Curated annotation (Swiss-Prot), chain C:
Subunit structure: Homodimer. The RNAP catalytic core consists of 2 alpha, 1 beta, 1 beta' and 1 omega subunit. When a sigma factor is associated with the core the holoenzyme is formed, which can initiate transcription. Both the N- and C-terminus interact with different regions of transcriptional regulator CRP. The rRNA transcription and antitermination complex (rrnTAC) consists of RNAP, NusA, NusB, NusE (rpsJ), NusG, SubB, ribosomal protein S4, DNA and precursor rRNA; S4 is more flexible than other subunits.
Protein name: DNA-directed RNA polymerase subunit alpha
Organism annotation: Escherichia coli (strain K12)
Function description: DNA-dependent RNA polymerase (RNAP) catalyzes the transcription of DNA into RNA using the four ribonucleoside triphosphates as substrates. This subunit plays an important role in subunit assembly since its dimerization is the first step in the sequential assembly of subunits to form the holoenzyme.
Record PTM text: (Microbial infection) ADP-ribosylated on both alpha subunits by the phage T4 protein ModA. ADP-ribosylated on only one of the alpha subunits by the phage T4 protein Alt.
UniProtKB/Swiss-Prot annotation, chain E:
Statement on biotechnological application from the UniProt entry: Co-administration of salinamide and rifampicin or salinamide and myxopyronin suppresses the emergence of resistance to both antibiotics.
Family of this protein: Belongs to the RNA polymerase beta chain family.
Post-translational modification as stated in the protein's UniProt record: Acetylated on several lysine residues in the presence of glucose.
Species whose genome carries this gene: Escherichia coli (strain K12)
Tree of life domain: Bacteria
Protein name: DNA-directed RNA polymerase subunit beta
Function of the protein: DNA-dependent RNA polymerase (RNAP) catalyzes the transcription of DNA into RNA using the four ribonucleoside triphosphates as substrates.
Quaternary assembly: The RNAP catalytic core consists of 2 alpha, 1 beta, 1 beta' and 1 omega subunit. When a sigma factor is associated with the core the holoenzyme is formed, which can initiate transcription. The rRNA transcription and antitermination complex (rrnTAC) consists of RNAP, NusA, NusB, NusE (rpsJ), NusG, SubB, ribosomal protein S4, DNA and precursor rRNA; S4 is more flexible than other subunits. In pull-down experiments interacts with CedA. (Microbial infection) Interacts (via flap domain) with Escherichia phage lambda antitermination protein Q; this interaction renders bacterial RNAP resistant to transcription pausing and allows it to read through termination signals.
Swiss-Prot record, chain F:
Ranges for region Interaction with anti-sigma factors: 21-36
Disulfide bonds: none
Compartments it resides in: Cytoplasm
Role of this protein: Sigma factors are initiation factors that promote the attachment of RNA polymerase to specific initiation sites and are then released. This sigma factor is the primary sigma factor during exponential growth. Preferentially transcribes genes associated with fast growth, such as ribosomal operons, other protein-synthesis related genes, rRNA- and tRNA-encoding genes and prfB.
Family under the similarity heading: Belongs to the sigma-70 factor family. RpoD/SigA subfamily.
Organism: Escherichia coli (strain K12)
DNA-binding region: 11-29
Oligomeric and partner information: Interacts transiently with the RNA polymerase catalytic core formed by RpoA, RpoB, RpoC and RpoZ (2 alpha, 1 beta, 1 beta' and 1 omega subunit) to form the RNA polymerase holoenzyme that can initiate transcription. Identified in a complex containing RpoD, the RNA polymerase subunits RpoA, RpoB and RpoZ, CRP and DNA. Interacts with Rsd; this prevents interaction with the RNA polymerase catalytic core and with promoter DNA, and as a consequence, promotes transcription from promoters that require alternative sigma factors. (Microbial infection) Interacts with Escherichia phage lambda antitermination protein Q.
UniProt protein name: RNA polymerase sigma factor RpoD
Swiss-Prot record, chain G:
A Pfam cross-reference name: HTH_18
SMART domains tied to this protein: HTH_ARAC
DNA-binding region(s) from the entry: 25-46, 73-96
Domain of life per record: Bacteria
This protein's name: Regulatory protein SoxS
InterPro entries, per the entry: Homeodomain-like_sf, HTH_AraC, HTH_AraC-typ_CS, MarA-like, Tscrpt_reg_AraC-type_HTH
Organism encoding this protein: Escherichia coli (strain K12)
Any Gene Ontology CC annotation: cytosol
PROSITE patterns, per database record: HTH_ARAC_FAMILY_1 (PS00041), HTH_ARAC_FAMILY_2 (PS01124)
Amino acid sequence: GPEEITADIPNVGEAALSKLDESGIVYIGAEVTGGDILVGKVTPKGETQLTPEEKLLRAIFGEKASDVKDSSLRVPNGVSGTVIDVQVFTRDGVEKDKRA
Amino acid sequence: TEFLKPRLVDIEQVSSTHAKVTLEPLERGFGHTLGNALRRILLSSMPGCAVTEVEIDGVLHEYSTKEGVQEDILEILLNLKGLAVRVQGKDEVILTLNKSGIGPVTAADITHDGDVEIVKPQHVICHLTDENASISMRIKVQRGRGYVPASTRIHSEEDERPIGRLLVDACYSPVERIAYNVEAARVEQRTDLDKLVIEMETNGTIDPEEAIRRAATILAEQLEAFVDLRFDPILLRPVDDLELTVRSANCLKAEAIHYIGDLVQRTEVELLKTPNLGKKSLTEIKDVLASRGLSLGMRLENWPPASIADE
Amino acid sequence: ATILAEQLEAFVD
Amino acid sequence: TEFLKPRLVDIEQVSSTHAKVTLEPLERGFGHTLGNALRRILLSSMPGCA
Amino acid sequence: GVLKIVKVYLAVKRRIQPGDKMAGRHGNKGVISKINPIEDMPYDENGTPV
Amino acid sequence: FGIDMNTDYTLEEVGKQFDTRERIRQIEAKALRKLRHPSRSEVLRSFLDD
Amino acid sequence: MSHQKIIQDLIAWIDEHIDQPLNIDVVAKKSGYSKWYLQRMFRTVTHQTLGDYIRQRRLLLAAVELRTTERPIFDIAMDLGYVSQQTFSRVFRRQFDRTPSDYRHRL
């Protein structure tokens, strides 16, 4: 399946989703720290089963599954500063998105 | 004994920036001792008011441009770091500065309050060459000591701020240059006495006595080590307002327990053996003891107040 | 310590 | 004013005259200053006999 | 194979740490071993440090 | 569900043994309840932060 | 004491642990009297019976539990107190006048 970029990312709390737009790109001029997010990228997870300990454990609390596996870009650690410029490359024919 | 007390004698200013002060008289061999000591105090540890936080319209990050000004923005932030202000009573001030018109940007053009004392009126900040562009900044001034380089605060204080609060490194030192010289003090019976010449070179914002005075308050406190030394809210309540397991509040008052101090002594062998409670009740009876840290049957200090409450 | 503390009495008050 | 105040930590008194005394922590740049106070004011000013 | 590529410049400012390489102008290399408070550096008879 | 075994039966696969097909799954509902009531799920809610 | 307060101390007791698979013997345990007497003492205070309100409270939760969980309808029966989902819809459709699957999906 085709991947895409949106800020609705699984396994994330409020702190990493604090300073993004609607489109998962950091505002021009935010502060950053290694361990956070710049691009919210997600992939179609291929349906693979698991060793059945989690399977009854999924059936205890009602674990909702995801076809949404995180493969986003995160800031390399030890590096801490300011983001000053972005730009977006997009094909011709695909609809130009909001930040485009 | 042959002690003598040193007295502050003269204060004379060369400029308002440059001042000298003699000290008289020290005792035999004490010249270098108190001189080298006081040099290490005035270099690092005097309080002074420096610029810590700038914030300005039309700015999204630090390294942008701004139309109509000559310098770049971090030359500006390099520039007003050397702007000196004296604060008298307020722990923390906010200035204001608005300007337009073609020409150089002064410091005296800020709308300073009655208690705010700027020092140097000719310290150039910016160069406005187009009258259509304006400058609009707000300058947060604090009072502190040391050389906190503006980054360890934001590594520690993560109260989330919006975009625009530009941080700059503080240079809290009010002192820049200090030396001492050792001359000979004449008192006609003690010709071993030595008087001191202490130089100070700084900006404004300094009383030349206080720097010597507050330094003496530092050594006065840092020598005490060598002379002197060589109620819980739900515990005063009944069972009715405990906010615990669903069927425990209406039933614990049925067995003569209408206090929590009356509850922390009641046994685990016979409270549940009189058929008026449940099996899920003892576990959260235990939570009132375990989460506070008491034992079973522990007699306590004085539980009952003037009000004994039950229905 | 009493040598240094008594030497600095005249500056605190 | 954000100074510190230490406490006397240990006196491993070996003899009636030989002992190490430790003292920590201070605000920075005082361990030289207290020492260079005590290096000279003690060795060059104390009453006694000879 | 690409759909869209977002590419973001970020800017970091790096300060001197004990262990940046240093050199003169004749080839004498150097490692900065300690940063020092201004107190116990050497200084001249007029009152400037070095 | 296959813990500590290798056969993974269904509703019809033990219901031909025991005596029931309408009470097999249903008795797990209180095996749910006191377990999903947080008196034992302290070792189970911890792993659901995956 | 007076018996009207004692049943008002017992009306909440059943209603507070509705999630459990509770039976009458645990209810007469808090009463301190016999099981038959609590069948009379609850009636002579509430003007409302006990042995149907144990089922009615789990039907009052069935106003909530069948509106909150997307979990299957075969599971919800025993924590209401029935060994059969067929018996659960047997006591639903007389009382709340629908098939219970149309209670979850019709919002």
